[PDB]
Design a protein around this ligand. Structure first.
Ligand SMILES: CC1(C)CNc2cc(O)c(C(=O)N3Cc4ccccc4C3)cc21
Length: 207
């Protein structure tokens, strides 16, 4: 288990997201789906000239899995996935150019929905989740598990769970008062409202 500190302003942004009430929390789902769509675009374009890229699975899709028993909302895609370096670099350690400006915008009264435009939309997951687990599988690399309950740090380890083929799975352990995101019609309506033009199938697993 390797522990990493978040870059100074990303940690500050996570603290702001967790400790300030924002009304429009539902946008976390749009942000997560948009990352899945970009990872799906990446593998799709690479596969055009190299069919071996899809040896790990040909279907390009997004699955949404609410689980009321464990209080988790899981977002699974079959995108390009992340290597160990992609995970540590892109999920917290390296500075994002828009972090400082986004924190100043929020302080000046900007809506939380603006997050994606500043390139830090992943962190909107902390609007609804007390803990976030990201399992990822990239071609020619092993399966990794990234995890953080915020507080300034995250962990990376080799994943020993169920193999995923290729892609990324985001497991959101929802805050006690954020259980509306486990309801089938509430998930369906946030998808129609914010992610209707995403070019990939988005399937909801009704429990
Ligand atoms: C964790 C989070 C940022 C939120 N949710 C996801 C979902 C993901 O599939 C991925 C992912 O695997 N990648 C790799 C890649 C390559 C090019 C462009 C974008 C991305 C994001 C990442 C994320």
């Amino acid at each position: 288990v390797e522990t990493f500190a978040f870059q100074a302003e990303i940690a500050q942004l996570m603290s702001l997201i967790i400790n300030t009430f924002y009304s429009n929390k539902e946008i976390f789902l749009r942000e997560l789906i948009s990352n899945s769509s970009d990872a799906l675009d990446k593998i799709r374009y690479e596969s055009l000239t190299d069919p071996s890229k899809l040896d790990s699975g040909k279907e390009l899709h997004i699955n949404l899995i609410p689980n009321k028993q464990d209080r988790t909302l899981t977002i699974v895609d079959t995108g390009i996935g992340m290597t160990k370096a992609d995970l540590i670099n892109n999920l917290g350690t390296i500075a994002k150019s828009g972090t400082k400006a986004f924190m100043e915008a929020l302080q000046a009264g900007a809506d939380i929905s603006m997050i994606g435009q500043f390139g830090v939309g992943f962190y909107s997951a902390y609007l609804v989740a007390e803990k976030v687990t990201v399992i990822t599988k990239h071609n020619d690399d092993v399966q990794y598990a990234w995890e953080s309950s915020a507080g300034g740090s995250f962990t990376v380890r080799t994943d020993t769970g169920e193999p995923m083929g290729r892609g990324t799975k985001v497991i959101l352990h929802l805050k006690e008062d954020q259980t509306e995101y486990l309801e089938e019609r509430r998930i369906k309506e946030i998808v129609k409202k914010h992610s209707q033009f995403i070019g990939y199938p988005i399937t909801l697993f009704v429990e």
